């Protein structure tokens, strides 16, 4: 059974953004809430409907009126950006109910342009009969980027694996394409280029044998 | 305080899981202990929790397969899950609980493990390859470079990796891992240090595959 809970939302920063889980088997429960940031385990910030937990600052706040509870989050910062849960104990059935989870995103975060670092393979990889051209793509905002690469100036058709971007503990991203290629496929060009283009912006790294 | 939970890294379908979870900083008699997993989607599920006296809960859905037990002079808690099933897929985390009971009962997942990742499968452990990536200042800012480890082919998720035996942590970024086509995982973990401490300074990245039980120590050097 998972409790009910708010649709993801978006809250300009200074606002206030409420959050709120709900259910039959809710009733007068007392409703913890738990928060999830990338990169971390979760954390308890409410507990029993109400009680701030330590390192809950006092712009979060908990209460419950009939089979709704609601977290309400005062003066809203992009640190609070992350997902919500909701929890309550049912000693008739003996189980743990949690809610669905809910999606913070704070609005009006800046653009964040990528770093951009190509790696060209290792003398060891070559020696062990392969090799892979790295390039690494980090704190961009927002989490999309498009990802090409060249051998000298043709377009690179085969060989290429990329993540998809990763949010990390900033709040911006990550993303990293690799370029597998024989050793003879790397010497035999004059270079190969990574090119990561980013709202619009472009960077290209190059690295030659 | 949960250490990391302890697990297989991957699981055959129709297997048994099983997870080790270790008290640090204090008694695994003193609380309930319970076991939550979070799924590749970001949700949550309780499966069970426990008391080292045998008061225990499970949850009904898994209560045919589910077993929880505590050892208190290994302060440990361990959770077996038989008969596993591609949903069984998920990140299992350890906690520490509150417990209440007045005119009400209440509990409350107070402090979290950092979760032990289950992988649902029938490939094998694969161990990774580890190649330098050779420090380069031509993308870093003044005085600085990039160095790191290429840590290729391995599955299941994840690899841990430290520099320096965990001397070195300013300017660490591990990258999440690719997968690839074949089904293995690789990644890169880079390093941005002081250009003048390429002399003078070391630097190993240790790289712990525990489902393989492989590990490495490699130098990188310009």
């Known amino acids: 059974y998972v409790l009910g809970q708010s649709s993801s939302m978006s809250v300009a920063p200074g606002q206030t953004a409420k959050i709120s889980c709900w259910g039959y088997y809710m009733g007068t429960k007392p409703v913890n809430w738990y928060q999830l940031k990338p990169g971390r385990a979760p954390s308890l910030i409410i507990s029993y409907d109400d009680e701030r937990a330590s390192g809950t600052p006092a712009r979060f706040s908990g209460s419950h009126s009939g089979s709704t509870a609601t977290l309400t989050i005062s003066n809203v910062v992009p640190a609070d950006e992350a997902d919500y849960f909701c929890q309550v104990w049912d000693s008739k059935y003996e189980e743990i109910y949690f809610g669905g989870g809910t999606a913070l995103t704070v609005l009006g975060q800046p653009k964040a342009a990528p770093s951009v670092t190509l790696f060209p393979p290792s003398s060891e990889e070559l020696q062990a009969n392969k090799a892979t051209l790295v390039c690494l793509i980090s704190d961009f905002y927002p989490g999309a980027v498009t990802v090409a690469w060249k051998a000298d100036s043709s377009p690179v058709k085969a060989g290429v694996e990329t993540t998809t971007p990763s949010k990390q503990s900033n709040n911006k991203y990550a993303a990293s394409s690799y370029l597998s290629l024989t050793p003879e496929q790397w010497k035999s060009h004059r270079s190969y280029s990574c090119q990561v283009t980013h709202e619009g912006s472009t960077v290209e790294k190059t690295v030659a044998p | 305080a949960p250490l990391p939970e302890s697990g297989p890294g991957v699981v055959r379908p129709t297997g048994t899981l099983s997870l080790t979870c270790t008290a640090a900083?204090?008694?695994?008699?003193?609380?309930?202990w319970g076991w939550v997993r979070q799924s590749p989607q970001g949700t949550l599920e309780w499966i069970a929790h426990?008391?080292?006296?045998?008061?225990?809960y499970v949850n009904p859905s898994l209560k045919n397969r589910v077993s929880i037990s505590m050892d208190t002079s290994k302060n440990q808690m361990s959770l077996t899950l038989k008969t596993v099933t591609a949903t069984d897929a998920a990140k299992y985390h350890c906690?520490?609980?509150?417990?209440?009971?007045?005119?009400?009962?209440?509990?409350?997942?107070?402090?979290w493990g950092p979760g032990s990742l289950v992988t649902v499968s029938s490939a094998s452990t694969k161990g990774p390859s580890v190649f330098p990536l050779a420090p380069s200042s031509k993308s870093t800012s003044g005085g600085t470079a990039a160095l790191g480890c290429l840590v290729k082919d391995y599955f299941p998720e994840p690899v841990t990796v430290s520099w320096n035996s965990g001397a070195l942590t300013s300017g660490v970024h591990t990258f999440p891992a690719v997968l690839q086509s074949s089904g293995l995982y690789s990644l890169s973990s880079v390093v941005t240090v002081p250009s003048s401490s390429l002399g003078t300074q070391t630097y190993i990245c240790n790289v712990n595959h525990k489902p393989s039980n492989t590990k490495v120590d490699k130098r990188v050097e310009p």
């Open positions: 900083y204090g008694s695994i008699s003193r609380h309930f």
């Open positions: 906690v520490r609980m509150g417990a209440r009971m007045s005119d009400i009962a209440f509990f409350s997942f107070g402090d």
């Open positions: 426990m008391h080292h006296l045998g008061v225990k």
